[PDB]
Design an enzyme around this catalytic site. Structure first.
Site, PDB file in Angstrom:
ATOM      1  CG  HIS A 169      -2.111  -1.020   0.844  1.00  0.00           C
ATOM      2  ND1 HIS A 169      -3.264  -1.159   1.600  1.00  0.00           N
ATOM      3  CD2 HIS A 169      -2.171  -1.849  -0.277  1.00  0.00           C
ATOM      4  CE1 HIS A 169      -3.998  -2.078   0.947  1.00  0.00           C
ATOM      5  NE2 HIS A 169      -3.399  -2.493  -0.131  1.00  0.00           N
ATOM      6  CG  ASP A 203       6.304   8.256  -0.818  1.00  0.00           C
ATOM      7  OD1 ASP A 203       5.550   7.379  -0.375  1.00  0.00           O
ATOM      8  OD2 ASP A 203       5.851   9.254  -1.369  1.00  0.00           O
ATOM      9  CB  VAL A 252       5.027 -22.630   5.417  1.00  0.00           C
ATOM     10  CG1 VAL A 252       6.153 -23.133   4.515  1.00  0.00           C
ATOM     11  CG2 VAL A 252       5.058 -23.344   6.756  1.00  0.00           C
TER      12      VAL A 252
HETATM   13 CA   LIG Z   1       1.556 -20.764   2.938  1.00  0.00          CA
HETATM   14 CA   LIG Z   2       3.634   5.899  -0.637  1.00  0.00          CA
END
Ligand SMILES: [Ca+2]
Ligand SMILES: [Ca+2]
Ligand code: HEM
Ligand SMILES: *[C@@H]1O[C@H](CO)[C@@H](O[C@@H]2O[C@H](CO)[C@@H](O)[C@H](O)[C@H]2NC(C)=O)[C@H](O)[C@H]1NC(C)=O
Ligand SMILES: [K+]
Length: 336
Positions: free
Chosen positions: A48, A69, A199
């Site tokens: 994000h 950033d 995992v």
């Molecule tokens: Ca997995």
């Molecule tokens: Ca950003």
């Protein structure tokens, strides 16, 4: 080359502070180097933070976002109000304190915490780590984050703008092999997206291809699809990408080799880490990243199901010969 105060040797002097950040994150943020919720949350945050980058917006004369950033932290007040950024506040605040206490930029800190977190999860590759991203950022524009109810065309377009090909989109989604959901259906909080939430393996690609037969909670949450066995959650974007002709053959090739899946993911994550930057202006400090324990288990179709239960969607490649298990269907416990 160089030796840092603690005796470790590194390439550049710029890497030495990261040995301190490493200790704090493992001891505190990751509670003793665990592969649990803090790692899964940081993996949502790196994506994000980086995806708030849009060349189409820049071309149209608008601010397109600075990419990786650290703007999700620096401007958390603006960015955590976006609909796909819920359930992140506590993790953003924990990271803010480490950034400020160590004097490292927030953008570098998010990349570093992603590499260190994945190293606590068995089967993970050693992600590249570069340092030198400027600490100054502007808020990311709204609407640049793919959501779980979006069509495959919408996702591929937004991701293609940012710079990812359809194959790299599939590659990036290997992170759902260490994942659960908390906000789509809170009635089955932390229901895992694959049978091995701890995992980093191929199971996510196998299990999303299985016929949806089970409703895991009392009702269906937002963008929820029927899953293959109790306890597992299946979101719509994942179910569709596994089956869409534009992505189905890459999804299928990701099912039988953990080594292939890890290398493709490492390459896609290295590209995402410099969205908004020139990697030739950054210093490589990948040697600070430790190895993960190896995953020695082979890919399997769980609980007695066979290839007959896979909705084979790649018309050109036969489905891989994967092993079967002699058991009843599993019921998955919440991810830790
Ligand atoms: Ca997995
Ligand atoms: Ca950003
Ligand atoms: C096509 C793009 C993607 C979509 C639509 C998507 C959507 C979602 C959704 C809806 C959740 C559940 C969040 C919640 O309610 O708790 C989730 C979880 C997660 N996603 Fe994705 N995701 C995508 C790409 C990625 C990428 C590229 C990464 C990171 C490299 C990522 C890493 C994760 C992780 C690790 C979780 C688990 C979080 C937890 O267990 O707390 N996702 N994703
Ligand atoms: C990166 O920039 C951020 C945003 O300006 C700085 O964060 C502030 O730092 C001060 C003092 O260090 C804190 O009191 C504020 O609470 C922080 N603000 C936010 C929004 O977090 C950060 O210090 C900068 N980092 C470096 C190394 O310069
Ligand atoms: K390989």
């Amino acid at each position: 080359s160089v030796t840092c105060p603690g005796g470790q040797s590194t390439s550049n002097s710029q890497c030495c502070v990261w040995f301190d950040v490493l200790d704090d994150l493992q001891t505190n943020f990751y509670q003793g180097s665990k592969c649990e919720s803090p790692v899964r949350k940081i993996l949502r945050i790196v994506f994000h933070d980086a995806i708030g980058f849009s060349p189409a917006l820049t071309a149209a004369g608008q601010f397109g976002g600075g990419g990786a950033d650290g703007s999700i932290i620096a401007h958390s007040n603006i960015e955590l109000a976006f609909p796909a950024n819920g359930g992140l506040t506590d993790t953003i605040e924990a990271l803010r304190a480490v950034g400020i206490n160590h004097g490292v930029s927030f953008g570098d800190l998010i990349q570093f915490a992603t590499a260190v977190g994945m190293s606590n999860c068995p089967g993970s590759p050693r992600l590249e780590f570069l340092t030198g991203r400027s600490n100054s950022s502007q808020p990311s524009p709204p609407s640049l984050i793919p959501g779980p109810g979006n069509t495959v065309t919408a996702i591929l377009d937004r991701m293609g703008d940012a710079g990812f090909s359809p194959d790299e989109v599939v590659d990036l989604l290997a992170a759902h092999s260490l994942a659960s959901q908390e906000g789509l259906n809170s009635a089955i909080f932390r229901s895992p997206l694959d049978s091995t939430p701890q995992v980093f393996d191929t199971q996510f690609y196998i299990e999303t291809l299985l016929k949806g037969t089970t409703q895991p909670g009392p009702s269906l949450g937002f963008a929820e699809e029927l899953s293959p066995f109790p306890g597992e959650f299946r979101m719509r974007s994942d179910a569709l990408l596994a089956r869409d002709s534009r992505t189905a053959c890459r999804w299928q090739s990701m099912t039988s080799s953990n080594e292939v899946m890890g290398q493709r993911y490492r390459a896609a994550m290295a590209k995402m880490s410099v969205l908004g930057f020139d990697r030739n202006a950054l210093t490589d400090c990948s040697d600070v990243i430790p190895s993960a324990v190896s995953n020695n288990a082979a890919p399997v179709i769980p609980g007695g199901l066979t290839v007959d239960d896979i909705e084979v969607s790649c018309p050109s490649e036969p489905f891989p010969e994967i092993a079967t298990a002699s058991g009843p269907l599993p019921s998955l416990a919440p991810a830790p």
